[PDB]
DNA sequence: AAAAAAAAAAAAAAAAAAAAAAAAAAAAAAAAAAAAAAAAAAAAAAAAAAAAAAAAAAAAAAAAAAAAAAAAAAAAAAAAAAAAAAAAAAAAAAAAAAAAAAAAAAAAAAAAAAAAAA
């Protein structure tokens, strides 16, 4: 409940990037293996 | 033959622009009244000129408002601190003349083709 904490560059960079890839491998990039479709064809259909 | 950089695939992030149609305003560029300014004519109040004159500076001298001296007291202005306005100095710049490289027209002449004669 402070205005301003101290953050490193390294735990900041790691969580932001890893949530990125992590959020863009299972939710935009690969397709399932049982129907073959990524989220936005099966949203869409 | 090694290094480096572009480009393309597909789901994601985030932007930008041209016109039509009417009615009003705001810039911005013109003709066109309208009055300063200037050239060139005749024309007419002012200086000149002269004689003649009388109104205000000199001069005597008193006296009455005065400018320096004395004192008390009020407090305007000057110089030192800071804080804003407004103008030359210097440097930079976008079109703009100069130069150099690529596209389109040109015919001279020949390869290949098409066509026909005897």
Known sequence: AREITPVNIEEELKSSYLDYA???????????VRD??????????
């Open 22 to 32: 992590m959020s863009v491998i299972v939710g935009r990039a690969l397709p399932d």
């Open 36 to 45: 073959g479709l990524k989220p936005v064809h099966r949203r869409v259909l």
